[PDB]
Amino acid sequence: TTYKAPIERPEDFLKDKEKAKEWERKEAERIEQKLERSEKEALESYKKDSVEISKYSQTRNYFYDYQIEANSREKEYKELRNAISKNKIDKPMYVYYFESPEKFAFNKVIRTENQNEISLEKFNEFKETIQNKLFKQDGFKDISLYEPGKGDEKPTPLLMHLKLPRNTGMLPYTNTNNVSTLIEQGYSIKIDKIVRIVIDGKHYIKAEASVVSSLDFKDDVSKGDSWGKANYNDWSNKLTPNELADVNDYMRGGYTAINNYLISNGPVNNPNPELDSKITNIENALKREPIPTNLTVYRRSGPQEFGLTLTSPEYDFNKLENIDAFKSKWEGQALSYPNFISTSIGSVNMSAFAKRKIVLRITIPKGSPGAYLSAIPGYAGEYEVLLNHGSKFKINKIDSYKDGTITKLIVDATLIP
Ligand SMILES: S=C(NCc1ccco1)Nc1ccccc1Cl
Ligand SMILES: [Zn+2]
Ligand SMILES: [Zn+2]
């Protein structure tokens, strides 16, 4: 039943640097024979501009489809992405890399770079920050295949020991006299265990991390639409006529009256049985065929969703103090929506919400209520997934990016069951 690999390796090289580097060099030479000339050229460009190429691969998919196509960095992105995808690994591989604790919204400082010790207080604070959370990792990154020792670069107090699952793209390559391994990331990680370790008198937190598989179509709306239609083409027929009629009414513009009623706390202030009945039916419809796999969706959120307005000075994310204030208020916090929440399987910008500065990137766990409404023909919504009213979201991490000269935010959140 097991595939025999061309160059044998264990799942983890552990502290064995010599054996890891030997394997990595042999793999780099082996995979080089599978690469196309345009793929080899993309790898050469990568070594001369890795920082900018990596930053581009993190946020390229948030633009309009025509902007992605027109971007001068897109050709290089596609070629380097294809190169890594030429070596999907046959069995899991544990990798190692140093990470900033800020990557997990930990701002209390594990220890300063010049400091040695890690207090029990900071270790416990870090544990409570990362426990029971998923964190999206995205973009090109170089990783190591063995545990660092004395002679190795250790730029932070946090060491990631991450299990890459089978079929993850991994590209070992040569760079002048050295060898490195490139991955594209693009998955959720969970930190299962943290331990204090000592390397040459200095203390580090070693984080045992694993990938929690999910669908994330990003700018590939065609692939997302195929998945949505494969799972929800027969959804309309699973509903009662009243449920289907209320879902249809909502989709055709009834969402304004229903959601305004929910936002205004209408069930408490002025109960409307006709609106309550529609809400009941739509909620039931969303529970008929739960989201069948962990799924990432994207919502271009209005400032009112985060207690701001279009003219609020706090909504100007071009100022670093406004980003820091937003992160302080929302990172690690829960956000509950009284209304139904429309999202898209695509991360691309859309003309209807062109100027919205907040991109809510939601991971929906398997079994959540929801439905791919765009499986119903002739609908305005773009590749739409509707989430149930009253949904709660845990905000895990917030990032920023530039959309032209306007700074926008990416809010990495998880739907709570
Ligand atoms: S940050 C880091 N590894 C990640 C990496 C590979 C290339 C560039 O950055 N340090 C390290 C060095 C040697 C062995 C193991 C580790 Cl974790
Ligand atoms: Zn010590
Ligand atoms: Zn309700």
Distance CA 306, CA 393 (A): 12
Q: Are 199 and 283 members of one domain? A: no
HSE on the CB side for 147, CA within 13 Å?
A: 14
Q: Which ligand is nearest to the CA of 146?
A: 1
The terminus-to-terminus CA distance of the chain in angstroms comes to 37
Compute the distance from residue 260 Cα to the ligand 3 centre, in Å. Answer: 13
Distance CA 216, CA 236 (A): 24
Q: Are 245 and 365 members of one domain? A: yes
Longest dimension (CA), the chain: 73
Compute the distance from residue 387 Cα to the ligand 1 centre, in Å. Answer: 40
Q: Are 374 and 229 members of one domain? A: yes
Q: Are 247 and 183 members of one domain? A: no
Q: Is 143 in the pocket of ligand 1 (CB under 6 A)?
A: yes
The protein residue whose alpha carbon is closest to atom 8 in ligand 1 is 142
- Edge-to-edge strand ranges of the sheet holding 371-372: 334-336, 392-403, 406-415, 358-364, 295-301, 341-344, 384-387, 371-372
Query: What token pair was written down for 417?
Result: 């069951």
Q: Which atom in ligand 1 lies closest to the alpha carbon of residue 160?
A: 17
The sign one gets for the Cα dihedral 236, 237, 243, 244 is: positive
Angle at 160 between CA 154 and CA 166, to 5 degrees: 130
Q: Are 183 and 103 members of one domain? A: yes
Compute the distance from residue 262 Cα to the ligand 3 centre, in Å. Answer: 8
Q: Which ligand is nearest to the CA of 369?
A: 3
Q: Which ligand is nearest to the CA of 115?
A: 2
Residue with tokens 């002679």: 151
Cα 137 to Cα 103, 187, 406: the distances in Å are 9, 6, 23
Q: Is 152 in the pocket of ligand 1 (CB under 6 A)?
A: yes
Distance of CA 267 to the CA centre of its chain: 35
Point out the domain boundary residue: 215, 237, 253: 215
Query: Is 135:414 a contact under the CB 8 Å cutoff?
Result: no
Instruction: Give residue 155's domain range.
Output: 1-215
Q: Which atom in ligand 1 lies closest to the alpha carbon of residue 180?
A: 7
Angle at 322 between CA 319 and CA 326, to 5 degrees: 145
Q: Are 211 and 223 members of one domain? A: no
Query: What token pair was written down for 25?
Result: 């060099």
Query: Is 328:380 a contact under the CB 8 Å cutoff?
Result: no
Point out the domain boundary residue: 147, 180, 215: 215
Point out the domain boundary residue: 189, 215, 241: 215
Q: Is 64 in the pocket of ligand 1 (CB under 6 A)?
A: no
The breaks in the chain (C to N more than 2.5 Å) occur after none
Compute the distance from residue 339 Cα to the ligand 3 centre, in Å. Answer: 9
Compute the distance from residue 389 Cα to the ligand 3 centre, in Å. Answer: 7
Q: Which ligand is nearest to the CA of 150?
A: 1
Looking at the DSSP assignment, which residues form a beta bridge with residue 169? Answer: 88
Query: Is 370:291 a contact under the CB 8 Å cutoff?
Result: yes
Distance of CA 142 to the CA centre of its chain: 18
Q: Looking at residue 253, what DSSP letter applies? A: I
Q: Are 121 and 224 members of one domain? A: no
How many residues does the structure list for the chain?
417
Distance CA 184, CA 140 (A): 4
Q: Are 27 and 159 members of one domain? A: yes
**What percentage of the chain's residues is helix, strand, coil (to nearest 5)?**
35, 25, 35
Compute the distance from residue 78 Cα to the ligand 3 centre, in Å. Answer: 45
Resolution of the structure in the document, Å: 1.7
Q: Which ligand is nearest to the CA of 197?
A: 2
Q: Looking at residue 238, what DSSP letter applies? A: G
Q: Is 353 in the pocket of ligand 1 (CB under 6 A)?
A: no
Which one, of 280, 298, 292, 273, lies nearest residue 410 by Cα?
Answer: 298
Compute the distance from residue 155 Cα to the ligand 1 centre, in Å. Answer: 9
Distance CA 212, CA 188 (A): 5
Residue with tokens 């959140």: 413
Distance CA 15, CA 83 (A): 28
Q: Which atom in ligand 1 lies closest to the alpha carbon of residue 144?
A: 6
The sign one gets for the Cα dihedral 130, 341, 326, 265 is: negative
Looking at the DSSP assignment, which residues form a beta bridge with residue 163? Answer: 94, 210
Query: Is 397:106 a contact under the CB 8 Å cutoff?
Result: no
Q: Are 47 and 145 members of one domain? A: yes
Distance of CA 55 to the CA centre of its chain: 15
The stretches of 60-137 forming alpha helices (DSSP H) are: 65-70, 74-84, 120-130
Compute the distance from residue 217 Cα to the ligand 3 centre, in Å. Answer: 30
The protein residue whose alpha carbon is closest to atom 15 in ligand 1 is 148
Query: Is 395:330 a contact under the CB 8 Å cutoff?
Result: yes
Q: Which atom in ligand 1 lies closest to the alpha carbon of residue 147?
A: 15
Q: Are 235 and 197 members of one domain? A: no
Q: Are 319 and 175 members of one domain? A: no
Compute the distance from residue 197 Cα to the ligand 2 centre, in Å. Answer: 10
CB atoms within 10 A of CB 150: 8
Report residue 274: phi and psi, to 5°.
-65, -45
Q: How many domains does the chain have?
A: 2
Distance CA 343, CA 384 (A): 6
- The region, left, alpha or beta by phi > 0 then psi within -120 to 50, assigned to residue 361 is beta
Cβ neighbours for 176, distance < 8 A, ≥ 6 positions apart:
none
Q: Which ligand is nearest to the CA of 201?
A: 2
Q: Which atom in ligand 1 lies closest to the alpha carbon of residue 159?
A: 17
Q: Are 135 and 54 members of one domain? A: yes
Compute the distance from residue 62 Cα to the ligand 1 centre, in Å. Answer: 29
Residue with tokens 């692939």: 223
